[PDB]
Amino acid sequence: MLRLSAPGQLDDDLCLLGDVQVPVFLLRLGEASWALVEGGISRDAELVWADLCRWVADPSQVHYWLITHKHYDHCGLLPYLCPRLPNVQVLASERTCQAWKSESAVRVVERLNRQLLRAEQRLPEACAWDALPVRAVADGEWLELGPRHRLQVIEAHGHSDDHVVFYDVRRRRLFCGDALGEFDEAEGVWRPLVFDDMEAYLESLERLQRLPTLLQLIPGHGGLLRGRLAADGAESAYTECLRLCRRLLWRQSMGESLDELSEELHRAWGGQSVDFLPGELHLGSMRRMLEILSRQAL
Protein backbone atom coordinates (compact mmCIF):
# COMPACT_ATOMS: atom_id res chain seq x y z
CA MET A 1 0.00 0.00 0.00
CA LEU A 2 1.37 3.49 -0.85
CA ARG A 3 -1.48 6.06 -0.44
CA LEU A 4 -3.49 5.64 2.76
CA SER A 5 -6.79 7.29 1.83
CA ALA A 6 -9.77 6.75 4.11
CA PRO A 7 -10.38 8.42 7.49
CA GLY A 8 -9.19 6.50 10.51
CA GLN A 9 -6.20 5.98 12.77
CA LEU A 10 -4.03 6.93 9.83
CA ASP A 11 -0.68 6.51 11.56
CA ASP A 12 0.69 5.86 15.10
CA ASP A 13 -0.45 9.40 16.06
CA LEU A 14 -2.17 10.94 12.99
CA CYS A 15 -5.85 10.83 12.01
CA LEU A 16 -7.27 12.10 8.73
CA LEU A 17 -10.69 13.73 9.03
CA GLY A 18 -13.33 15.01 6.69
CA ASP A 19 -13.38 14.29 2.99
CA VAL A 20 -10.26 12.53 1.74
CA GLN A 21 -9.95 14.96 -1.18
CA VAL A 22 -9.68 17.97 1.18
CA PRO A 23 -9.09 16.74 4.76
CA VAL A 24 -7.99 18.20 8.08
CA PHE A 25 -5.20 16.19 9.74
CA LEU A 26 -5.47 15.63 13.50
CA LEU A 27 -2.25 14.95 15.43
CA ARG A 28 -2.14 13.04 18.73
CA LEU A 29 0.61 14.72 20.76
CA GLY A 30 -0.43 14.45 24.41
CA GLU A 31 -2.93 12.99 26.81
CA ALA A 32 -4.29 16.46 27.30
CA SER A 33 -3.75 18.41 24.09
CA TRP A 34 -4.29 17.75 20.39
CA ALA A 35 -3.60 19.66 17.07
CA LEU A 36 -5.14 20.01 13.59
CA VAL A 37 -3.53 20.78 10.21
CA GLU A 38 -4.62 21.69 6.65
CA GLY A 39 -7.84 23.53 7.40
CA GLY A 40 -9.91 22.33 4.43
CA ILE A 41 -13.19 23.83 3.19
CA SER A 42 -16.25 25.35 4.84
CA ARG A 43 -18.71 22.56 4.04
CA ASP A 44 -16.70 19.87 5.87
CA ALA A 45 -17.31 21.47 9.30
CA GLU A 46 -20.48 19.55 10.20
CA LEU A 47 -18.74 16.45 8.88
CA VAL A 48 -15.48 17.17 10.71
CA TRP A 49 -17.20 17.68 14.08
CA ALA A 50 -18.96 14.33 13.61
CA ASP A 51 -15.48 12.83 13.21
CA LEU A 52 -13.62 15.13 15.62
CA CYS A 53 -15.64 14.22 18.71
CA ARG A 54 -15.00 10.55 17.91
CA TRP A 55 -11.29 11.23 18.63
CA VAL A 56 -11.22 14.28 20.91
CA ALA A 57 -13.35 13.62 23.98
CA ASP A 58 -13.80 17.34 24.79
CA PRO A 59 -12.58 19.93 22.24
CA SER A 60 -11.16 22.34 24.84
CA GLN A 61 -8.02 20.19 24.67
CA VAL A 62 -7.58 21.11 20.98
CA HIS A 63 -4.87 23.78 21.33
CA TYR A 64 -3.11 24.28 17.98
CA TRP A 65 -4.20 24.58 14.36
CA LEU A 66 -1.79 24.54 11.41
CA ILE A 67 -2.61 26.33 8.15
CA THR A 68 -0.57 26.22 4.94
CA HIS A 69 -1.82 29.21 2.89
CA LYS A 70 -4.73 31.58 2.30
CA HIS A 71 -6.57 29.63 -0.42
CA TYR A 72 -10.13 28.55 0.29
CA ASP A 73 -9.39 24.82 0.02
CA HIS A 74 -7.03 24.95 3.07
CA CYS A 75 -8.71 27.53 5.37
CA GLY A 76 -12.48 27.09 5.07
CA LEU A 77 -12.89 25.49 8.50
CA LEU A 78 -11.21 28.44 10.28
CA PRO A 79 -14.10 30.89 10.90
CA TYR A 80 -16.60 28.03 11.39
CA LEU A 81 -14.67 25.98 14.00
CA CYS A 82 -12.29 28.45 15.79
CA PRO A 83 -14.94 30.09 18.06
CA ARG A 84 -16.35 26.78 19.31
CA LEU A 85 -12.74 25.63 19.88
CA PRO A 86 -11.92 27.94 22.84
CA ASN A 87 -8.19 27.11 23.10
CA VAL A 88 -7.55 27.21 19.34
CA GLN A 89 -4.35 28.76 17.98
CA VAL A 90 -3.83 29.09 14.22
CA LEU A 91 -0.32 29.13 12.72
CA ALA A 92 0.55 30.42 9.25
CA SER A 93 2.94 32.80 7.54
CA GLU A 94 2.97 36.49 8.32
CA ARG A 95 1.58 37.17 4.85
CA THR A 96 -1.23 34.70 5.57
CA CYS A 97 -2.23 36.51 8.77
CA GLN A 98 -1.93 39.84 6.95
CA ALA A 99 -4.08 38.40 4.16
CA TRP A 100 -6.83 37.43 6.61
CA LYS A 101 -6.65 40.85 8.29
CA SER A 102 -7.04 42.40 4.83
CA GLU A 103 -10.64 43.11 3.87
CA SER A 104 -9.83 41.93 0.36
CA ALA A 105 -8.76 38.30 -0.18
CA VAL A 106 -11.48 37.24 2.32
CA ARG A 107 -14.65 38.07 0.39
CA VAL A 108 -13.20 36.08 -2.51
CA VAL A 109 -12.45 33.23 -0.09
CA GLU A 110 -16.05 33.42 1.15
CA ARG A 111 -17.35 33.29 -2.43
CA LEU A 112 -15.15 30.31 -3.31
CA ASN A 113 -16.25 28.45 -0.18
CA ARG A 114 -19.92 29.31 -0.72
CA GLN A 115 -19.91 28.08 -4.33
CA LEU A 116 -19.34 24.46 -3.14
CA LEU A 117 -22.48 24.22 -0.97
CA ARG A 118 -25.38 21.78 -1.05
CA ALA A 119 -28.94 22.82 -1.89
CA GLU A 120 -30.32 22.87 1.68
CA GLN A 121 -27.08 23.40 3.62
CA ARG A 122 -26.77 26.29 6.08
CA LEU A 123 -23.29 26.91 7.45
CA PRO A 124 -23.06 27.52 11.22
CA GLU A 125 -22.26 30.77 13.00
CA ALA A 126 -18.82 32.30 12.50
CA CYS A 127 -16.66 34.98 14.08
CA ALA A 128 -15.00 37.68 12.00
CA TRP A 129 -12.00 36.58 9.95
CA ASP A 130 -9.71 39.02 11.77
CA ALA A 131 -11.20 38.08 15.16
CA LEU A 132 -9.90 34.49 15.23
CA PRO A 133 -6.55 33.89 16.98
CA VAL A 134 -3.41 33.82 14.82
CA ARG A 135 0.31 33.67 15.62
CA ALA A 136 2.45 34.29 12.55
CA VAL A 137 5.38 31.92 12.02
CA ALA A 138 8.36 32.68 9.78
CA ASP A 139 10.97 30.66 7.89
CA GLY A 140 12.78 28.01 9.89
CA GLU A 141 11.14 28.88 13.21
CA TRP A 142 11.17 25.79 15.40
CA LEU A 143 7.67 24.89 16.58
CA GLU A 144 7.01 23.19 19.94
CA LEU A 145 3.64 21.53 19.41
CA GLY A 146 4.19 19.06 22.24
CA PRO A 147 6.80 17.06 24.15
CA ARG A 148 6.60 14.32 21.49
CA HIS A 149 6.67 16.57 18.36
CA ARG A 150 8.90 19.47 17.30
CA LEU A 151 7.76 20.73 13.91
CA GLN A 152 9.82 23.07 11.72
CA VAL A 153 8.11 25.66 9.54
CA ILE A 154 9.72 25.96 6.10
CA GLU A 155 9.12 28.91 3.77
CA ALA A 156 7.99 27.21 0.52
CA HIS A 157 6.55 29.70 -1.97
CA GLY A 158 5.46 29.11 -5.57
CA HIS A 159 1.86 28.08 -5.07
CA SER A 160 1.25 31.41 -3.31
CA ASP A 161 3.14 34.27 -1.69
CA ASP A 162 1.79 33.29 1.77
CA HIS A 163 2.81 29.62 1.73
CA VAL A 164 4.59 27.44 4.30
CA VAL A 165 5.13 23.73 4.88
CA PHE A 166 5.32 22.18 8.36
CA TYR A 167 8.10 19.59 8.65
CA ASP A 168 8.76 17.14 11.50
CA VAL A 169 12.28 15.81 11.99
CA ARG A 170 11.77 12.74 14.22
CA ARG A 171 9.24 10.68 12.31
CA ARG A 172 10.21 12.51 9.08
CA ARG A 173 6.73 13.37 7.78
CA LEU A 174 5.90 16.55 5.87
CA PHE A 175 2.74 18.62 5.44
CA CYS A 176 2.97 20.16 1.96
CA GLY A 177 -0.57 21.34 1.29
CA ASP A 178 -0.02 22.41 -2.33
CA ALA A 179 3.73 23.03 -2.19
CA LEU A 180 4.31 20.08 -4.54
CA GLY A 181 1.11 19.62 -6.51
CA GLU A 182 -2.21 17.82 -6.52
CA PHE A 183 -1.34 14.14 -6.26
CA ASP A 184 -2.62 11.85 -9.01
CA GLU A 185 -4.69 8.83 -7.99
CA ALA A 186 -4.73 7.42 -11.53
CA GLU A 187 -1.34 8.20 -13.07
CA GLY A 188 0.58 8.34 -9.77
CA VAL A 189 2.91 11.18 -10.80
CA TRP A 190 2.39 14.68 -9.44
CA ARG A 191 0.34 17.38 -11.15
CA PRO A 192 2.26 20.69 -10.73
CA LEU A 193 0.55 23.78 -9.34
CA VAL A 194 2.14 27.18 -10.03
CA PHE A 195 -0.04 30.23 -9.39
CA ASP A 196 2.34 33.04 -8.25
CA ASP A 197 5.98 32.34 -9.41
CA MET A 198 8.05 29.51 -10.89
CA GLU A 199 11.34 30.89 -9.57
CA ALA A 200 10.10 30.60 -5.99
CA TYR A 201 8.37 27.30 -6.83
CA LEU A 202 11.46 25.49 -8.11
CA GLU A 203 13.61 27.09 -5.40
CA SER A 204 11.15 25.74 -2.83
CA LEU A 205 11.25 22.27 -4.38
CA GLU A 206 15.06 22.38 -4.32
CA ARG A 207 14.99 23.30 -0.63
CA LEU A 208 12.43 20.50 -0.01
CA GLN A 209 14.32 17.77 -1.90
CA ARG A 210 17.50 18.65 0.00
CA LEU A 211 15.69 17.34 3.15
CA PRO A 212 16.32 13.81 4.51
CA THR A 213 14.74 10.82 2.79
CA LEU A 214 11.18 11.37 3.96
CA LEU A 215 9.46 8.37 5.51
CA GLN A 216 6.05 10.06 5.02
CA LEU A 217 4.58 12.81 2.86
CA ILE A 218 1.16 14.40 3.42
CA PRO A 219 -0.19 16.78 0.73
CA GLY A 220 -3.30 18.89 1.19
CA HIS A 221 -5.42 16.75 -1.17
CA GLY A 222 -5.49 12.95 -1.06
CA GLY A 223 -4.30 11.65 2.28
CA LEU A 224 -0.87 10.39 3.24
CA LEU A 225 1.94 9.18 0.97
CA ARG A 226 4.32 6.48 2.14
CA GLY A 227 7.37 4.57 0.97
CA ARG A 228 9.12 5.32 -2.31
CA LEU A 229 6.55 7.95 -3.33
CA ALA A 230 7.26 10.03 -0.22
CA ALA A 231 11.02 9.48 -0.53
CA ASP A 232 11.35 11.34 -3.87
CA GLY A 233 8.11 13.32 -3.98
CA ALA A 234 10.11 16.54 -3.96
CA GLU A 235 12.07 15.35 -7.01
CA SER A 236 9.03 14.29 -9.03
CA ALA A 237 7.14 17.55 -8.49
CA TYR A 238 10.13 19.51 -9.82
CA THR A 239 10.36 17.05 -12.70
CA GLU A 240 6.66 17.44 -13.53
CA CYS A 241 6.82 21.24 -13.43
CA LEU A 242 9.70 21.08 -15.91
CA ARG A 243 7.75 18.52 -17.97
CA LEU A 244 4.70 20.76 -18.27
CA CYS A 245 7.03 23.63 -19.13
CA ARG A 246 8.48 21.53 -21.96
CA ARG A 247 4.98 20.72 -23.21
CA LEU A 248 3.88 24.37 -23.10
CA LEU A 249 7.01 25.64 -24.84
CA TRP A 250 6.65 22.97 -27.52
CA ARG A 251 3.03 23.93 -28.15
CA GLN A 252 4.10 27.58 -28.35
CA SER A 253 6.69 26.52 -30.95
CA MET A 254 4.00 24.69 -32.92
CA GLY A 255 1.87 27.84 -32.61
CA GLU A 256 -1.05 26.61 -30.50
CA SER A 257 -2.43 29.33 -28.25
CA LEU A 258 -2.73 28.94 -24.49
CA ASP A 259 -6.47 28.28 -24.85
CA GLU A 260 -5.91 24.82 -26.33
CA LEU A 261 -3.39 23.67 -23.73
CA SER A 262 -5.39 24.99 -20.77
CA GLU A 263 -8.47 23.23 -22.17
CA GLU A 264 -6.50 20.00 -22.60
CA LEU A 265 -5.15 20.17 -19.05
CA HIS A 266 -8.65 20.89 -17.71
CA ARG A 267 -10.31 17.97 -19.49
CA ALA A 268 -7.41 15.69 -18.51
CA TRP A 269 -7.17 16.69 -14.83
CA GLY A 270 -10.74 17.62 -13.88
CA GLY A 271 -11.31 14.15 -12.42
CA GLN A 272 -10.36 15.24 -8.87
CA SER A 273 -11.29 18.87 -8.22
CA VAL A 274 -14.96 18.56 -9.27
CA ASP A 275 -15.92 18.18 -5.59
CA PHE A 276 -14.06 21.23 -4.19
CA LEU A 277 -13.67 23.51 -7.22
CA PRO A 278 -16.15 24.43 -10.00
CA GLY A 279 -15.18 23.24 -13.45
CA GLU A 280 -15.57 26.72 -14.93
CA LEU A 281 -13.04 28.11 -12.43
CA HIS A 282 -10.50 25.29 -12.83
CA LEU A 283 -10.07 26.29 -16.48
CA GLY A 284 -9.21 29.83 -15.41
CA SER A 285 -6.86 28.56 -12.71
CA MET A 286 -4.98 26.42 -15.22
CA ARG A 287 -4.94 29.41 -17.59
CA ARG A 288 -3.26 31.53 -14.91
CA MET A 289 -0.77 28.73 -14.21
CA LEU A 290 0.07 28.32 -17.89
CA GLU A 291 0.43 32.08 -18.33
CA ILE A 292 2.92 32.21 -15.43
CA LEU A 293 4.85 29.22 -16.78
CA SER A 294 4.97 30.62 -20.32
CA ARG A 295 6.05 34.06 -19.13
CA GLN A 296 8.82 32.76 -16.83
CA ALA A 297 10.18 29.53 -18.36
CA LEU A 298 12.77 30.18 -21.08
Partner: protein
Protein backbone atom coordinates in the same frame (compact mmCIF):
# COMPACT_ATOMS: atom_id res chain seq x y z
CA UNK B 1 20.53 21.16 -21.43
CA UNK B 2 19.96 23.79 -18.79
CA UNK B 3 21.04 22.90 -15.30
CA UNK B 4 24.74 23.36 -14.62
CA UNK B 5 26.00 25.01 -17.80
CA UNK B 6 23.13 27.46 -18.13
CA UNK B 7 23.58 28.14 -14.41
CA UNK B 8 27.27 28.98 -14.86
CA UNK B 9 26.54 31.26 -17.82
CA UNK B 10 23.77 33.02 -15.91
CA UNK B 11 25.93 33.49 -12.82
CA UNK B 12 28.77 34.92 -14.91
CA UNK B 13 26.46 37.31 -16.78
CA UNK B 14 24.77 38.35 -13.52
CA UNK B 15 28.10 38.99 -11.76
CA UNK B 16 29.41 41.05 -14.71
CA UNK B 17 27.35 44.24 -14.09
CA UNK B 18 28.04 44.13 -10.33
CA UNK B 19 30.65 46.85 -9.77
CA UNK B 20 30.96 46.53 -5.95
CA UNK B 21 32.32 43.88 -3.61
CA UNK B 22 29.20 43.87 -1.42
CA UNK B 23 27.09 42.94 -4.44
CA UNK B 24 29.46 40.05 -5.20
CA UNK B 25 29.19 38.74 -1.65
CA UNK B 26 25.41 39.28 -1.75
CA UNK B 27 24.96 37.07 -4.81
CA UNK B 28 27.39 34.60 -3.23
CA UNK B 29 25.28 34.48 -0.05
CA UNK B 30 22.10 34.05 -2.09
CA UNK B 31 23.57 31.14 -4.05
CA UNK B 32 25.10 29.47 -1.00
CA UNK B 33 21.74 29.69 0.79
CA UNK B 34 20.14 28.17 -2.31
CA UNK B 35 22.74 25.37 -2.16
CA UNK B 36 21.47 24.36 1.32
CA UNK B 37 24.20 25.98 3.46
CA UNK B 38 23.53 28.71 5.99
CA UNK B 39 27.04 30.23 6.20
CA UNK B 40 29.91 30.91 3.80
CA UNK B 41 33.36 32.48 3.92
CA UNK B 42 36.07 33.55 1.46
CA UNK B 43 39.53 33.38 3.02
CA UNK B 44 42.82 34.56 1.51
CA UNK B 45 46.11 33.25 2.88
CA UNK B 46 49.03 35.48 1.93
CA UNK B 47 52.63 34.18 1.63
CA UNK B 48 54.83 37.30 2.14
CA UNK B 49 55.59 37.25 5.92
CA UNK B 50 57.05 33.78 6.32
CA UNK B 51 57.28 33.79 10.13
CA UNK B 52 53.66 35.01 10.52
CA UNK B 53 51.77 34.45 7.24
CA UNK B 54 48.73 36.69 7.63
CA UNK B 55 45.41 35.04 6.75
CA UNK B 56 42.56 37.49 6.15
CA UNK B 57 38.96 36.49 5.57
CA UNK B 58 35.43 37.70 4.84
CA UNK B 59 32.21 35.79 5.33
CA UNK B 60 28.90 35.51 7.14
CA UNK B 61 29.50 33.71 10.43
CA UNK B 62 28.78 34.99 13.96
CA UNK B 63 30.79 38.18 14.29
CA UNK B 64 32.25 37.09 17.62
CA UNK B 65 33.74 34.07 15.82
CA UNK B 66 35.48 36.55 13.58
CA UNK B 67 36.61 38.38 16.76
CA UNK B 68 37.88 35.05 18.11
CA UNK B 69 40.10 34.86 15.04
CA UNK B 70 41.43 38.38 15.64
CA UNK B 71 42.40 37.34 19.20
CA UNK B 72 43.79 33.82 18.69
CA UNK B 73 44.30 33.75 14.87
CA UNK B 74 43.18 30.21 14.08
CA UNK B 75 43.85 30.84 10.38
CA UNK B 76 47.57 30.24 10.99
CA UNK B 77 46.76 26.76 12.40
CA UNK B 78 43.40 25.93 10.77
CA UNK B 79 43.79 22.64 8.81
CA UNK B 80 41.01 23.60 6.38
CA UNK B 81 43.04 26.50 4.99
CA UNK B 82 46.29 24.52 5.26
CA UNK B 83 44.91 21.72 3.08
CA UNK B 84 45.12 24.10 0.12
CA UNK B 85 48.90 24.26 0.45
CA UNK B 86 49.50 20.52 0.10
CA UNK B 87 46.64 19.70 -2.30
CA UNK B 88 44.01 21.54 -4.32
CA UNK B 89 41.31 18.98 -3.44
CA UNK B 90 38.06 19.88 -1.74
CA UNK B 91 37.88 18.59 1.84
CA UNK B 92 34.62 18.01 3.73
CA UNK B 93 34.87 18.68 7.45
CA UNK B 94 34.88 15.98 10.11
CA UNK B 95 36.24 15.29 13.57
CA UNK B 96 39.07 13.36 11.87
CA UNK B 97 40.34 16.33 9.86
CA UNK B 98 40.85 18.63 12.88
CA UNK B 99 42.56 16.10 15.18
CA UNK B 100 45.75 18.19 15.17
CA UNK B 101 43.87 21.28 16.45
CA UNK B 102 40.71 20.15 18.22
CA UNK B 103 40.18 23.50 19.99
CA UNK B 104 39.14 25.20 16.75
CA UNK B 105 36.75 22.41 15.79
CA UNK B 106 35.18 22.16 19.25
CA UNK B 107 34.68 25.92 19.51
CA UNK B 108 33.22 25.88 15.99
CA UNK B 109 30.76 23.09 16.82
CA UNK B 110 29.84 25.08 19.93
CA UNK B 111 28.64 27.93 17.65
CA UNK B 112 26.72 25.93 15.05
CA UNK B 113 29.55 24.87 12.71
CA UNK B 114 29.07 21.09 12.56
CA UNK B 115 28.69 20.37 8.82
CA UNK B 116 30.53 21.93 5.92
CA UNK B 117 33.36 21.90 3.43
CA UNK B 118 36.20 24.11 2.22
CA UNK B 119 37.43 24.23 -1.38
CA UNK B 120 40.92 25.78 -1.84
CA UNK B 121 42.50 27.26 -4.96
CA UNK B 122 45.82 28.86 -5.87
CA UNK B 123 45.08 32.29 -7.29
CA UNK B 124 47.25 33.38 -10.27
CA UNK B 125 49.16 35.85 -8.03
CA UNK B 126 50.31 33.01 -5.67
CA UNK B 127 47.85 34.04 -2.93
CA UNK B 128 45.98 31.00 -1.64
CA UNK B 129 42.21 31.44 -1.42
CA UNK B 130 39.52 29.17 0.04
CA UNK B 131 35.73 29.11 -0.12
CA UNK B 132 34.15 27.49 2.94
CA UNK B 133 30.46 26.69 3.34
CA UNK B 134 28.84 25.50 6.56
CA UNK B 135 25.54 24.49 8.14
CA UNK B 136 24.24 22.94 11.34
CA UNK B 137 22.54 19.66 10.32
CA UNK B 138 22.44 17.45 7.20
CA UNK B 139 25.97 16.04 7.03
CA UNK B 140 27.27 16.22 3.47
CA UNK B 141 26.60 12.92 1.73
CA UNK B 142 29.04 11.54 -0.82
CA UNK B 143 26.30 12.04 -3.44
CA UNK B 144 26.12 15.82 -2.98
CA UNK B 145 29.90 16.15 -2.54
CA UNK B 146 30.68 16.38 -6.26
CA UNK B 147 27.88 18.88 -6.93
CA UNK B 148 29.15 21.07 -4.09
CA UNK B 149 32.67 20.65 -5.51
CA UNK B 150 31.72 21.88 -8.98
CA UNK B 151 29.55 24.78 -7.83
CA UNK B 152 32.05 26.00 -5.21
CA UNK B 153 34.83 25.70 -7.80
CA UNK B 154 32.94 27.94 -10.21
CA UNK B 155 32.02 30.40 -7.46
CA UNK B 156 35.53 30.65 -6.00
CA UNK B 157 37.09 31.07 -9.46
CA UNK B 158 34.73 33.93 -10.29
CA UNK B 159 35.11 35.62 -6.90
CA UNK B 160 38.91 35.32 -7.07
CA UNK B 161 38.94 36.99 -10.49
CA UNK B 162 36.42 39.69 -9.56
CA UNK B 163 37.89 40.63 -6.18
CA UNK B 164 41.28 40.83 -7.88
CA UNK B 165 39.65 43.11 -10.47
CA UNK B 166 37.91 45.24 -7.80
CA UNK B 167 41.21 45.88 -5.91
CA UNK B 168 39.86 44.30 -2.74
CA UNK B 169 42.17 44.67 0.30
CA UNK B 170 42.10 40.88 0.77
CA UNK B 171 43.63 39.87 -2.56
CA UNK B 172 45.87 42.89 -3.17
CA UNK B 173 49.02 42.55 -1.14
CA UNK B 174 51.76 45.24 -1.04
CA UNK B 175 51.90 46.52 -4.67
CA UNK B 176 55.45 46.53 -6.03
CA UNK B 177 56.34 47.32 -9.66
CA UNK B 178 59.70 46.76 -11.37
CA UNK B 179 60.97 47.84 -14.76
CA UNK B 180 62.79 45.25 -16.84
CA UNK B 181 66.31 45.99 -15.58
CA UNK B 182 65.20 45.68 -11.94
CA UNK B 183 63.41 42.43 -12.77
CA UNK B 184 66.54 41.12 -14.52
CA UNK B 185 68.94 42.08 -11.72
CA UNK B 186 66.60 40.70 -9.06
CA UNK B 187 66.21 37.47 -11.04
CA UNK B 188 69.99 37.14 -11.27
CA UNK B 189 70.07 37.65 -7.50
CA UNK B 190 67.37 34.99 -7.10
CA UNK B 191 69.56 32.61 -9.10
CA UNK B 192 72.24 33.87 -6.76
CA UNK B 193 75.49 34.97 -8.38
CA UNK B 194 78.10 37.15 -6.72
CA UNK B 195 78.16 40.85 -7.60
CA UNK B 196 81.36 40.49 -9.63
CA UNK B 197 79.83 37.65 -11.64
CA UNK B 198 76.71 39.74 -12.28
CA UNK B 199 78.85 42.68 -13.41
CA UNK B 200 80.86 40.41 -15.73
CA UNK B 201 77.86 38.76 -17.40
CA UNK B 202 75.86 42.01 -17.62
CA UNK B 203 78.98 44.07 -18.55
CA UNK B 204 78.09 46.91 -16.14
CA UNK B 205 80.23 48.37 -13.37
CA UNK B 206 79.64 47.49 -9.72
CA UNK B 207 78.47 51.01 -8.80
CA UNK B 208 75.41 50.96 -11.06
CA UNK B 209 74.37 47.48 -9.95
CA UNK B 210 74.83 48.48 -6.30
CA UNK B 211 72.61 51.52 -6.94
CA UNK B 212 70.00 49.14 -8.38
CA UNK B 213 70.37 46.87 -5.34
CA UNK B 214 69.82 49.77 -2.95
CA UNK B 215 66.78 50.83 -4.99
CA UNK B 216 65.31 47.31 -4.72
CA UNK B 217 66.05 47.17 -0.98
CA UNK B 218 64.31 50.51 -0.45
CA UNK B 219 61.34 49.53 -2.63
CA UNK B 220 60.72 46.19 -0.89
CA UNK B 221 61.63 47.79 2.49
CA UNK B 222 64.33 45.15 3.11
CA UNK B 223 67.36 45.05 5.46
CA UNK B 224 69.14 42.46 3.28
CA UNK B 225 69.11 40.91 -0.19
CA UNK B 226 67.51 37.74 1.18
CA UNK B 227 64.25 39.47 2.14
CA UNK B 228 63.94 41.09 -1.29
CA UNK B 229 64.72 37.88 -3.19
CA UNK B 230 62.43 35.71 -1.06
CA UNK B 231 59.53 38.18 -1.20
CA UNK B 232 59.90 38.63 -4.95
CA UNK B 233 60.01 34.86 -5.49
CA UNK B 234 56.93 34.33 -3.32
CA UNK B 235 54.92 37.14 -4.94
CA UNK B 236 55.77 35.88 -8.44
CA UNK B 237 57.26 39.17 -9.66
CA UNK B 238 60.36 37.18 -10.74
Amino acid sequence: DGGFLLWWDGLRSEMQPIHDSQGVFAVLEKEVRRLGFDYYAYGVRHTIPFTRPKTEVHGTYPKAWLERYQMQNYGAVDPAILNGLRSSEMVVWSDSLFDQSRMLWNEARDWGLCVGATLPIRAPNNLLSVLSVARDQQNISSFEREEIRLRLRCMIELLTQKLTDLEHPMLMSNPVCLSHREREILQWTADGKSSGEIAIILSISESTVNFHHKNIQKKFDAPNKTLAAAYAAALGLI
